[PDB]
Amino acid sequence: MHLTPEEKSAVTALWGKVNVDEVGGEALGRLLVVAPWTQRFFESFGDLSTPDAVMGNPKVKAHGKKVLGAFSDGLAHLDNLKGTFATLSELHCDKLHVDPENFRLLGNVLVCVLAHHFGKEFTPPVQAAYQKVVAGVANALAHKYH
């Protein structure tokens, strides 16, 4: 990453306060609602007919936790996101056929969820470092597409 020690510290420290369980379910569910077309990959999850139905769907919430988990661990290899997401990158390409654009939609939703959650704490300088991380994650994950 092109993170400043200062920027690294800011990311790291807010993360420390995150409930991945809660944030993962909310980020993924929001995605399914804001950008309804991402639902094409989660037909087997049930009825995503309403915000309520999406936000309530346990399959969604549980997928959300699996996703932020992986993201969470990526934050420990901020200096080689590429090597940390290589296998996950292949998988997404080769098995799931997920368009990398989706990785960017989620990142932005993630940022709206953090702001939502931390209010005051999520300052312009803090969002700025987060924007760089979400872009970095998305790029890493997309890296092995061919």
Added chain:
Amino acid sequence: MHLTPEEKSAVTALWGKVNVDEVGGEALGRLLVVAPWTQRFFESFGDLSTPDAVMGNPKVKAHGKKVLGAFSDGLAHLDNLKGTFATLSELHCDKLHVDPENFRLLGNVLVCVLAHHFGKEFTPPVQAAYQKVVAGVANALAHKYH
């Protein structure tokens, strides 16, 4: 810059046959004609009112040759684009205030120009090598923005 050796030989072989003077003028002129908004940087160039006025304007032709000149040098340092384009990146940012998206638009136009000129010789695979290259150059040009 994921230029495979075979991709780099291909870029280099074709670049061998280009008349930078000529291509430079066509690429630049064509940009001012397809994305007229880009004309914002050249109000001291005079008459850009029509395609003929643009394509034939001595100032556009002279500037195009400058731009491709710098690009050509870029192609001799495919290994270090960022280094190559550093002072130019600073200039576009700090003095000229050129939104970097402009660099990608020009790359695409350039690719159509090469297709226009080389016909059948601009094969699927040659286009893909040039796609990587215009992208590398745009990125190098945007590296010093802040």
Added chain:
Amino acid sequence: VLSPADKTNVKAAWGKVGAHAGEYGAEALERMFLSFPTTKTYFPHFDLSHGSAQVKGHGKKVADALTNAVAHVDDMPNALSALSDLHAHKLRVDPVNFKLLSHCLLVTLAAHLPAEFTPAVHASLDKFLASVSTVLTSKYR
């Protein structure tokens, strides 16, 4: 296309913004400038430092235009004619940038209207900013 639910949700949300839209306008710009530094290329003539009056004022201006848009949610194209003109023929901001301001504006509302920033409201505001962006870039060519 904004559904009736959508127009409702937007008016509600914006309804709660109230006397703070200007500050939210200003805050969104600041978040945009820091997160997407390339957007600064359009304001070389501004003092982009924290708390600049140039930024605060611009913030109000933007805020006000959104208000007017919510108010004429049914006739945006018309309520924003002049603004679409200005952007297409004078400012000529590149279209990618509208998506960036729209995003910094969600983040700002989210951070300020917790209870109100529900998943359905979020979806609506997004479509809305999208629609607004479409309108402001409709006369580009």
Added chain:
Amino acid sequence: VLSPADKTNVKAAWGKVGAHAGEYGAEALERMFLSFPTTKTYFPHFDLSHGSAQVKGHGKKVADALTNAVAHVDDMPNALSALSDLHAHKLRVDPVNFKLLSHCLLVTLAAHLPAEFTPAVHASLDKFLASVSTVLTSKYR
């Protein structure tokens, strides 16, 4: 919007395409596959090998649709409604990919019509492909 000039340009350049539309459609696709490998994710079910009949088959269908928009240059939204529906509801292709195909179609035409691919024609064809893309994406949300 497309101007009379544009309309003339497009009918003219496309006129020249004639009977090669199919082949040019196949070629635009292959170029797209090679230059923007991410577009491949939409065709997991295709044989994307060189000279794939699936691609030939598909290039032709794309070319017929473009040909149909040219024949109805004054009523594209209606001429392409069905295809707009399909793309919004079934295929759900992300919008950014339209610009990629557009681009590869322009490269292809340029590679085949040196005499007609003038600056003026290039500009018109670009606005046209952008309008086609806008129609196909209109019902997405």
